[PDB]
Design a protein around this ligand. Structure first.
Ligand code: MN
Ligand code: ZN
Length: 444
């Protein structure tokens, strides 16, 4: 079917008016558009992409850390087993570290080398390449000019904004509400995935070369999960590169497009995607969480799925839900009902546990909290832990306060005799936040 190769939702910008036009924001967050390519974004805003060129990055912080992926240079849109015999989903990829200066040297000499090959005239086996990924641009003292340039974007796409759920978390989530950079050579691949907790993502290509993107809508993610399981792969944790002929056979639609320098790619919530560099280029990217029923729902879903799969959630959705109720006026009826429902479940579960502890003669110790204090996760199983923290007698004494969930504490100490129970929020105060959380009127 032609329906299996649909056109890319595209927007063509010419000037700042186009960029700040409110129907642009609405188009991107619309659940019917799995991806939006905003062409000419940098040119329309007069963004200086030069601030992210390799030459500029070397000057700024030449010893900055780069995560290296070593990969094979695969042909076109395919992925072959190392012997060149058959197309498979699993990708070979090995990890190491380097610096911006050292990777810059490789990026440049890579280009010079292919110029010489091009002037020499005249199934594998495949060449080996290196991809510089996940470069941390969180420090405002190291990247002042770079980060300031990105405040020129329209609000809905900024790293920080009043309408961004990740801004309301209240603390840093590295690489989600901070910027990451990528330095590439041709063939540099990002394997198949969904964003952390299904949050939207924003990506700008710095150039000078192009990237090629492959995209599948959220509601087909289960099909790809089966494919992984039938090929002995972990959908969430393994490196895989889909066989397009398999997807076509299974009637999965695939959006495919080219991202040129200055183009911005908006990946909508839960959209499955994978990417490869066509030329030599750098990219920047971060996450955003629009205030919509769709975004909140898909985020909660992935939060619960990660528990079943024993994978940590980078976004603490309990902590976030309470902050929304504390600080945000919500006027969408559907979104409001979702948050209210979740808070009620949290409150009931907490009341049940607390009464069980008291009925068994276990002391609950008032511990309170400092504000802007991040959410806590279990030091053993990495689940989010809210309000009641389980800490060993020894860790308490030393005031290291090393957090455990209730289940992990019980597994260690059958009657909790080795633990104390710390409480960060009074029940009356949580009940009030819940009771005063009501639907705001908006005529929009
Ligand atoms: Mn991504
Ligand atoms: Zn645990």
């Amino acid at each position: 079917k032609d329906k299996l190769n649909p056109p890319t939702p595209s927007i063509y910008l010419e000037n700042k008016r186009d960029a700040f036009f409110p129907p642009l924001h609405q188009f991107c967050t619309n659940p019917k558009n799995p991806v939006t390519v905003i062409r000419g974004l940098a040119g329309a805003l007069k963004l200086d992409l030069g601030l992210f060129s390799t030459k500029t990055l070397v000057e700024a912080n030449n010893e900055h850390m780069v995560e290296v992926r070593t990969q094979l240079l695969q042909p076109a849109d395919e992925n072959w087993d190392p012997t060149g015999t058959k197309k498979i989903w699993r990708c070979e990829s090995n990890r190491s570290h380097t610096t911006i200066a050292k990777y810059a040297q490789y990026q440049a000499s890579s280009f010079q080398e292919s110029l010489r090959e091009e002037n020499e005239k005249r199934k594998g086996p495949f060449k080996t390449i290196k991809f510089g990924t996940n470069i941390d641009l969180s420090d405002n003292k190291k990247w002042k000019l770079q980060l300031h340039e990105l405040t020129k974007l329209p609000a809905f796409a900024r790293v920080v904004s009043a309408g961004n759920l990740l801004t309301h978390v209240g603390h840093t989530i590295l690489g989600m509400n901070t910027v990451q950079l990528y330095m590439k050579v041709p063939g540099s691949r990002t394997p198949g995935h969904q964003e952390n907790n299904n949050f939207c993502s924003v990506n700008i290509n710095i150039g000078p070369g192009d990237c090629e993107w492959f995209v599948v809508p959220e509601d087909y993610w289960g099909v790809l999960n089966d494919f992984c399981e039938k090929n002995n792969l972990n959908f969430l944790m393994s490196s895989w590169w889909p066989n397009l002929e398999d997807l076509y056979e299974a009637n999965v639609p695939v959006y495919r497009f080219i991202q040129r320098p200055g183009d911005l790619v908006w990946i909508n919530a839960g959209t499955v995607h994978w990417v490869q560099a066509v030329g030599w280029c750098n990219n920047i990217a971060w996450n955003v969480g629009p205030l919509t029923a769709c975004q909140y729902k898909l985020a909660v879903e992935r939060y619960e799925w990660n528990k079943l799969k024993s994978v940590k959630s980078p976004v603490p959705m309990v902590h976030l839900s309470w902050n929304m109720a504390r600080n945000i006026k919500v006027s969408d009826p559907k979104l409001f009902e979702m948050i209210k429902y979740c808070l009620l479940k949290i409150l009931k579960q907490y009341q049940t546990l607390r009464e069980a502890l008291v009925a068994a003669g276990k002391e609950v110790i008032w511990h309170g909290r400092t504000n802007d204090e991040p959410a806590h996760y279990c030091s053993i199983c990495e689940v989010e832990v809210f309000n009641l923290l389980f800490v060993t007698n020894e860790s308490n004494t030393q005031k290291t306060y090393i957090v455990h969930c209730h289940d992990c504490a019980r597994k260690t100490s059958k009657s909790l005799e080795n633990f104390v129970v710390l409480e960060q929020y009074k029940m009356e105060d949580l009940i009030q936040v819940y009771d005063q959380f009501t639907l705001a009127l908006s005529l929009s």
